[PDB]
Design a protein around this ligand. Structure first.
Ligand SMILES: NC(=O)[C@H](CCC1CCCCC1)NC(=O)c1ccc(CNC(=O)c2cnn(-c3ccccc3)c2N)cc1
Length: 350
Protein backbone atom coordinates (compact mmCIF):
# COMPACT_ATOMS: atom_id res chain seq x y z
CA UNK A 1 0.00 0.00 0.00
CA UNK A 2 3.04 2.37 -0.27
CA UNK A 3 2.17 5.45 -2.35
CA UNK A 4 4.05 6.45 -5.50
CA UNK A 5 6.50 9.32 -4.93
CA UNK A 6 7.66 12.13 -7.14
CA UNK A 7 10.76 14.22 -6.92
CA UNK A 8 11.26 17.87 -7.51
CA UNK A 9 13.74 20.53 -6.61
CA UNK A 10 12.36 23.36 -4.49
CA UNK A 11 14.39 26.21 -2.95
CA UNK A 12 17.50 24.39 -4.09
CA UNK A 13 16.69 21.18 -2.23
CA UNK A 14 15.23 17.82 -3.24
CA UNK A 15 11.64 17.10 -2.26
CA UNK A 16 10.36 13.60 -2.70
CA UNK A 17 6.70 13.33 -1.72
CA UNK A 18 3.65 11.18 -2.36
CA UNK A 19 1.52 12.00 -5.42
CA UNK A 20 -1.17 12.81 -2.95
CA UNK A 21 0.46 16.19 -2.39
CA UNK A 22 0.16 18.46 -5.41
CA UNK A 23 1.25 22.03 -6.30
CA UNK A 24 4.16 22.35 -3.80
CA UNK A 25 5.33 25.93 -3.21
CA UNK A 26 7.91 27.14 -0.62
CA UNK A 27 6.66 29.35 2.17
CA UNK A 28 8.11 31.48 4.95
CA UNK A 29 11.54 31.56 3.23
CA UNK A 30 13.26 30.45 6.47
CA UNK A 31 10.97 31.56 9.32
CA UNK A 32 9.31 28.18 9.15
CA UNK A 33 12.19 25.84 8.22
CA UNK A 34 12.08 24.10 4.89
CA UNK A 35 8.25 24.23 4.49
CA UNK A 36 6.06 24.08 1.33
CA UNK A 37 2.40 24.72 1.01
CA UNK A 38 0.60 21.95 -1.00
CA UNK A 39 -2.78 20.76 -2.12
CA UNK A 40 -3.94 17.60 -0.43
CA UNK A 41 -5.76 15.59 -3.12
CA UNK A 42 -7.26 13.22 -0.57
CA UNK A 43 -9.12 16.05 1.20
CA UNK A 44 -9.19 19.04 -1.19
CA UNK A 45 -7.57 21.23 1.49
CA UNK A 46 -4.24 22.96 1.59
CA UNK A 47 -1.52 21.62 3.87
CA UNK A 48 1.98 22.45 4.98
CA UNK A 49 4.80 19.94 4.32
CA UNK A 50 7.96 20.39 6.49
CA UNK A 51 11.10 18.59 5.43
CA UNK A 52 13.43 18.01 8.35
CA UNK A 53 17.04 19.12 7.93
CA UNK A 54 19.77 16.44 8.15
CA UNK A 55 17.65 14.42 10.53
CA UNK A 56 20.09 11.65 11.36
CA UNK A 57 23.42 13.40 10.88
CA UNK A 58 24.34 13.07 14.52
CA UNK A 59 22.96 11.88 17.83
CA UNK A 60 21.69 15.40 18.57
CA UNK A 61 19.89 15.69 15.22
CA UNK A 62 18.47 12.21 15.53
CA UNK A 63 17.13 12.84 19.06
CA UNK A 64 15.70 16.21 17.86
CA UNK A 65 13.92 14.44 15.00
CA UNK A 66 12.54 11.81 17.37
CA UNK A 67 11.41 14.50 19.84
CA UNK A 68 9.54 16.57 17.27
CA UNK A 69 7.80 13.54 15.80
CA UNK A 70 6.82 12.27 19.26
CA UNK A 71 5.42 15.63 20.25
CA UNK A 72 3.48 16.14 16.98
CA UNK A 73 2.05 12.62 17.18
CA UNK A 74 0.83 13.29 20.66
CA UNK A 75 -1.01 16.53 20.00
CA UNK A 76 -4.71 15.91 19.36
CA UNK A 77 -6.54 19.13 20.15
CA UNK A 78 -8.29 21.87 18.16
CA UNK A 79 -6.04 24.64 19.46
CA UNK A 80 -2.70 22.85 19.01
CA UNK A 81 -0.97 21.99 15.74
CA UNK A 82 -1.48 18.36 14.80
CA UNK A 83 0.03 15.84 12.51
CA UNK A 84 -1.94 15.07 9.40
CA UNK A 85 0.72 12.76 7.92
CA UNK A 86 4.37 11.76 8.22
CA UNK A 87 6.25 10.02 5.44
CA UNK A 88 9.59 9.03 4.05
CA UNK A 89 10.55 7.93 0.53
CA UNK A 90 12.64 5.20 2.11
CA UNK A 91 11.42 1.63 1.71
CA UNK A 92 13.34 0.34 4.66
CA UNK A 93 15.23 1.34 7.76
CA UNK A 94 18.47 0.88 5.90
CA UNK A 95 17.73 3.69 3.41
CA UNK A 96 15.83 5.91 5.86
CA UNK A 97 17.36 9.38 5.69
CA UNK A 98 14.56 11.90 5.26
CA UNK A 99 11.43 12.76 7.17
CA UNK A 100 8.49 14.94 6.10
CA UNK A 101 5.79 16.19 8.40
CA UNK A 102 2.41 17.33 7.18
CA UNK A 103 0.12 19.74 9.04
CA UNK A 104 -2.73 22.10 8.46
CA UNK A 105 -1.75 25.22 6.61
CA UNK A 106 -2.69 28.28 8.76
CA UNK A 107 -3.56 31.70 7.35
CA UNK A 108 -1.70 34.16 9.48
CA UNK A 109 0.12 34.48 12.73
CA UNK A 110 -1.05 36.73 15.53
CA UNK A 111 1.27 39.60 14.59
CA UNK A 112 -0.55 39.66 11.21
CA UNK A 113 -3.92 39.93 13.00
CA UNK A 114 -2.83 42.73 15.34
CA UNK A 115 -0.73 44.82 12.89
CA UNK A 116 0.04 47.43 15.64
CA UNK A 117 -3.70 48.09 16.14
CA UNK A 118 -5.97 47.31 19.06
CA UNK A 119 -8.39 44.38 18.82
CA UNK A 120 -11.91 44.57 20.14
CA UNK A 121 -12.44 43.19 23.61
CA UNK A 122 -14.72 40.40 22.24
CA UNK A 123 -12.01 39.38 19.71
CA UNK A 124 -9.39 39.34 22.52
CA UNK A 125 -11.65 37.16 24.66
CA UNK A 126 -11.94 34.65 21.83
CA UNK A 127 -8.24 34.58 20.96
CA UNK A 128 -6.97 34.29 24.51
CA UNK A 129 -9.70 31.75 25.36
CA UNK A 130 -8.38 29.50 22.59
CA UNK A 131 -4.72 29.91 23.64
CA UNK A 132 -5.65 28.97 27.18
CA UNK A 133 -7.72 26.02 25.99
CA UNK A 134 -4.71 24.71 24.02
CA UNK A 135 -2.41 25.36 26.98
CA UNK A 136 -4.67 23.46 29.41
CA UNK A 137 -4.27 20.52 27.09
CA UNK A 138 -0.47 20.89 26.61
CA UNK A 139 0.13 21.37 30.34
CA UNK A 140 -2.04 18.36 31.17
CA UNK A 141 0.53 16.23 29.26
CA UNK A 142 3.29 17.74 31.48
CA UNK A 143 4.59 19.63 28.47
CA UNK A 144 5.67 23.27 28.79
CA UNK A 145 5.90 25.30 25.60
CA UNK A 146 8.51 27.78 26.97
CA UNK A 147 8.52 30.07 23.90
CA UNK A 148 4.98 31.31 23.49
CA UNK A 149 4.75 34.51 21.44
CA UNK A 150 2.57 35.90 18.63
CA UNK A 151 4.64 34.33 15.83
CA UNK A 152 3.95 30.87 17.38
CA UNK A 153 0.14 31.40 17.30
CA UNK A 154 -1.65 30.97 14.00
CA UNK A 155 -5.19 31.58 12.97
CA UNK A 156 -7.44 30.89 10.07
CA UNK A 157 -10.17 33.17 8.54
CA UNK A 158 -12.74 31.89 11.02
CA UNK A 159 -10.39 33.08 13.78
CA UNK A 160 -9.69 29.51 14.88
CA UNK A 161 -6.29 29.47 16.62
CA UNK A 162 -3.52 26.91 16.97
CA UNK A 163 -0.44 26.85 19.13
CA UNK A 164 2.76 25.86 17.26
CA UNK A 165 6.53 26.10 17.77
CA UNK A 166 8.45 27.28 14.71
CA UNK A 167 11.70 26.95 16.64
CA UNK A 168 13.50 24.03 18.34
CA UNK A 169 11.33 22.40 20.94
CA UNK A 170 12.94 22.86 24.31
CA UNK A 171 12.32 20.16 26.88
CA UNK A 172 14.20 21.23 30.06
CA UNK A 173 14.92 24.32 32.19
CA UNK A 174 18.64 23.98 31.32
CA UNK A 175 18.02 25.22 27.74
CA UNK A 176 16.61 28.63 28.80
CA UNK A 177 20.11 30.15 28.81
CA UNK A 178 20.66 29.07 25.14
CA UNK A 179 19.51 30.78 21.94
CA UNK A 180 16.27 32.86 21.98
CA UNK A 181 14.80 34.95 19.07
CA UNK A 182 12.83 37.53 21.12
CA UNK A 183 12.72 37.84 24.89
CA UNK A 184 9.65 40.17 24.99
CA UNK A 185 7.33 37.35 26.15
CA UNK A 186 9.69 35.51 28.57
CA UNK A 187 8.88 35.14 32.23
CA UNK A 188 11.08 37.08 34.66
CA UNK A 189 12.19 33.92 36.52
CA UNK A 190 13.73 32.65 33.30
CA UNK A 191 15.45 36.01 32.65
CA UNK A 192 16.79 35.91 36.32
CA UNK A 193 18.00 32.29 36.07
CA UNK A 194 15.93 31.23 39.03
CA UNK A 195 15.50 27.71 37.63
CA UNK A 196 12.77 25.31 38.84
CA UNK A 197 10.35 26.74 36.25
CA UNK A 198 6.72 25.79 36.34
CA UNK A 199 4.13 25.61 33.63
CA UNK A 200 3.00 29.16 34.40
CA UNK A 201 6.04 30.47 32.48
CA UNK A 202 3.59 30.00 29.60
CA UNK A 203 0.87 31.94 31.42
CA UNK A 204 3.25 34.89 31.75
CA UNK A 205 3.63 34.84 27.97
CA UNK A 206 -0.14 34.74 27.54
CA UNK A 207 -0.48 37.79 29.77
CA UNK A 208 2.03 39.65 27.60
CA UNK A 209 0.20 38.62 24.46
CA UNK A 210 -3.20 39.58 25.85
CA UNK A 211 -1.93 43.02 26.83
CA UNK A 212 -0.60 43.55 23.34
CA UNK A 213 -3.89 42.50 21.70
CA UNK A 214 -5.72 44.97 23.85
CA UNK A 215 -3.35 47.98 23.44
CA UNK A 216 -1.83 47.26 20.06
CA UNK A 217 1.67 47.57 21.54
CA UNK A 218 4.27 45.29 23.01
CA UNK A 219 3.93 45.33 26.82
CA UNK A 220 7.63 44.86 27.66
CA UNK A 221 9.71 45.78 24.51
CA UNK A 222 13.13 45.58 26.15
CA UNK A 223 16.18 46.72 24.19
CA UNK A 224 18.39 43.99 25.72
CA UNK A 225 18.41 41.48 28.56
CA UNK A 226 18.87 43.96 31.46
CA UNK A 227 16.31 46.36 29.96
CA UNK A 228 13.74 43.55 29.61
CA UNK A 229 13.94 42.84 33.32
CA UNK A 230 13.85 46.51 34.24
CA UNK A 231 10.65 46.99 32.21
CA UNK A 232 9.06 43.94 33.79
CA UNK A 233 9.88 44.98 37.36
CA UNK A 234 8.54 48.47 36.82
CA UNK A 235 5.11 47.01 36.25
CA UNK A 236 5.08 44.05 38.64
CA UNK A 237 7.35 45.44 41.35
CA UNK A 238 10.41 44.34 43.26
CA UNK A 239 9.95 40.93 44.95
CA UNK A 240 7.76 40.84 48.10
CA UNK A 241 8.79 39.25 51.36
CA UNK A 242 7.10 35.95 50.56
CA UNK A 243 8.93 35.62 47.25
CA UNK A 244 12.37 36.67 48.63
CA UNK A 245 12.09 33.85 51.18
CA UNK A 246 12.11 31.40 48.26
CA UNK A 247 15.42 32.53 46.78
CA UNK A 248 18.15 29.90 47.77
CA UNK A 249 21.19 32.03 46.83
CA UNK A 250 22.69 34.95 48.68
CA UNK A 251 23.94 36.51 45.40
CA UNK A 252 20.60 36.28 43.57
CA UNK A 253 19.09 37.76 46.66
CA UNK A 254 22.10 40.08 46.91
CA UNK A 255 21.55 40.68 43.12
CA UNK A 256 17.81 41.09 43.43
CA UNK A 257 18.46 43.74 46.16
CA UNK A 258 20.98 45.47 43.83
CA UNK A 259 18.25 46.55 41.33
CA UNK A 260 16.22 49.64 42.26
CA UNK A 261 13.15 48.86 44.36
CA UNK A 262 9.96 49.33 42.33
CA UNK A 263 6.49 49.03 43.86
CA UNK A 264 3.99 47.05 41.78
CA UNK A 265 1.69 49.24 39.67
CA UNK A 266 -2.09 48.98 39.78
CA UNK A 267 -2.92 47.55 36.35
CA UNK A 268 -6.19 49.50 36.29
CA UNK A 269 -3.96 52.62 35.99
CA UNK A 270 -1.97 51.10 33.16
CA UNK A 271 -4.64 49.58 30.79
CA UNK A 272 -6.93 52.61 30.76
CA UNK A 273 -10.36 51.96 29.21
CA UNK A 274 -9.98 48.19 29.24
CA UNK A 275 -12.69 45.82 30.40
CA UNK A 276 -12.21 45.52 34.20
CA UNK A 277 -12.41 41.72 33.87
CA UNK A 278 -9.51 41.88 31.38
CA UNK A 279 -7.46 43.95 33.81
CA UNK A 280 -8.26 41.51 36.65
CA UNK A 281 -7.14 38.52 34.55
CA UNK A 282 -3.94 40.32 33.52
CA UNK A 283 -3.20 40.89 37.21
CA UNK A 284 -3.54 37.18 37.84
CA UNK A 285 -1.32 36.21 34.84
CA UNK A 286 1.48 38.72 35.40
CA UNK A 287 2.28 37.92 39.06
CA UNK A 288 5.92 38.03 39.71
CA UNK A 289 5.83 34.93 42.00
CA UNK A 290 5.14 32.06 39.62
CA UNK A 291 3.67 29.98 42.46
CA UNK A 292 0.89 32.52 42.67
CA UNK A 293 0.25 32.91 38.96
CA UNK A 294 -3.07 31.66 37.59
CA UNK A 295 -3.04 28.35 35.75
CA UNK A 296 -4.57 27.67 32.33
CA UNK A 297 -7.47 25.67 33.81
CA UNK A 298 -8.12 28.39 36.40
CA UNK A 299 -7.98 31.11 33.77
CA UNK A 300 -10.55 29.33 31.56
CA UNK A 301 -13.03 29.67 34.46
CA UNK A 302 -12.42 33.41 34.89
CA UNK A 303 -15.43 35.62 34.20
CA UNK A 304 -13.63 37.33 31.32
CA UNK A 305 -14.39 34.20 29.19
CA UNK A 306 -18.00 33.74 30.17
CA UNK A 307 -19.28 33.86 26.59
CA UNK A 308 -16.90 31.08 25.47
CA UNK A 309 -16.18 28.87 28.46
CA UNK A 310 -17.55 25.36 28.37
CA UNK A 311 -16.20 23.16 31.15
CA UNK A 312 -17.26 20.10 29.18
CA UNK A 313 -15.33 21.02 26.09
CA UNK A 314 -11.92 21.94 27.46
CA UNK A 315 -10.27 18.57 27.17
CA UNK A 316 -7.04 17.19 28.59
CA UNK A 317 -4.35 15.10 27.01
CA UNK A 318 -3.36 11.47 27.28
CA UNK A 319 -0.16 11.06 29.31
CA UNK A 320 2.98 11.72 27.29
CA UNK A 321 6.03 9.55 28.08
CA UNK A 322 9.09 11.75 28.02
CA UNK A 323 11.43 9.32 29.64
CA UNK A 324 13.43 9.25 26.38
CA UNK A 325 14.75 12.64 27.25
CA UNK A 326 16.86 11.06 30.02
CA UNK A 327 18.31 8.39 27.70
CA UNK A 328 21.75 8.06 26.02
CA UNK A 329 21.30 6.05 22.89
CA UNK A 330 23.28 5.41 19.76
CA UNK A 331 22.55 7.23 16.58
CA UNK A 332 21.08 4.14 14.85
CA UNK A 333 18.79 3.61 17.86
CA UNK A 334 17.33 7.06 17.68
CA UNK A 335 16.92 6.51 13.91
CA UNK A 336 15.16 3.17 14.43
CA UNK A 337 12.84 4.61 17.13
CA UNK A 338 11.92 7.35 14.64
CA UNK A 339 11.35 4.89 11.81
CA UNK A 340 9.07 2.87 14.03
CA UNK A 341 7.03 5.98 14.86
CA UNK A 342 6.67 6.81 11.13
CA UNK A 343 5.44 3.24 10.44
CA UNK A 344 2.96 3.25 13.33
CA UNK A 345 1.36 6.60 12.48
CA UNK A 346 -2.44 6.47 12.17
CA UNK A 347 -4.00 9.41 10.36
CA UNK A 348 -6.76 11.47 11.92
CA UNK A 349 -10.36 10.86 10.67
CA UNK A 350 -11.22 12.32 7.25
N1 LIG B 1 9.27 22.72 16.97
C1 LIG B 1 8.69 21.56 17.29
O1 LIG B 1 9.33 20.52 17.57
C2 LIG B 1 7.18 21.53 17.24
C3 LIG B 1 6.59 20.36 18.02
C4 LIG B 1 5.15 20.50 18.39
C5 LIG B 1 4.83 21.62 19.39
C6 LIG B 1 3.39 22.06 19.20
C7 LIG B 1 2.99 23.12 20.21
C8 LIG B 1 3.18 22.63 21.60
C9 LIG B 1 4.60 22.24 21.84
C10 LIG B 1 5.06 21.18 20.83
N2 LIG B 1 6.76 21.51 15.82
C11 LIG B 1 5.81 22.32 15.37
O2 LIG B 1 5.18 23.07 16.14
C12 LIG B 1 5.51 22.33 13.90
C13 LIG B 1 4.86 23.43 13.35
C14 LIG B 1 4.53 23.46 12.01
C15 LIG B 1 4.91 22.44 11.17
C16 LIG B 1 4.60 22.51 9.68
N3 LIG B 1 3.64 23.55 9.35
C17 LIG B 1 4.01 24.79 9.06
O3 LIG B 1 5.19 25.12 9.05
C18 LIG B 1 2.94 25.77 8.78
C19 LIG B 1 1.54 25.67 8.92
N4 LIG B 1 0.93 26.84 8.80
N5 LIG B 1 1.95 27.74 8.56
C20 LIG B 1 1.62 29.14 8.42
C21 LIG B 1 1.26 29.65 7.19
C22 LIG B 1 1.00 31.01 7.05
C23 LIG B 1 1.08 31.85 8.15
C24 LIG B 1 1.42 31.34 9.38
C25 LIG B 1 1.70 29.98 9.53
C26 LIG B 1 3.16 27.13 8.51
N6 LIG B 1 4.29 27.76 8.25
C27 LIG B 1 5.57 21.35 11.71
C28 LIG B 1 5.88 21.30 13.06
Amino acid sequence: ERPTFYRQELNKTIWEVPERYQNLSPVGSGAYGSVCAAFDTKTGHRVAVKKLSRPFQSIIHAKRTYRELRLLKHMKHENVIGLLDVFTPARSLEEFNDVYLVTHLMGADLNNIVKCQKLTDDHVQFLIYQILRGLKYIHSADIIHRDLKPSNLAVNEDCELKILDFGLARHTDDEMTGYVATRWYRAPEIMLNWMHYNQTVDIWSVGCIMAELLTGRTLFPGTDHIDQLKLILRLVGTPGAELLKKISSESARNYIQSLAQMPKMNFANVFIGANPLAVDLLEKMLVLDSDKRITAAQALAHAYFAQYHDPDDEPVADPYDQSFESRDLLIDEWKSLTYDEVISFVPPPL
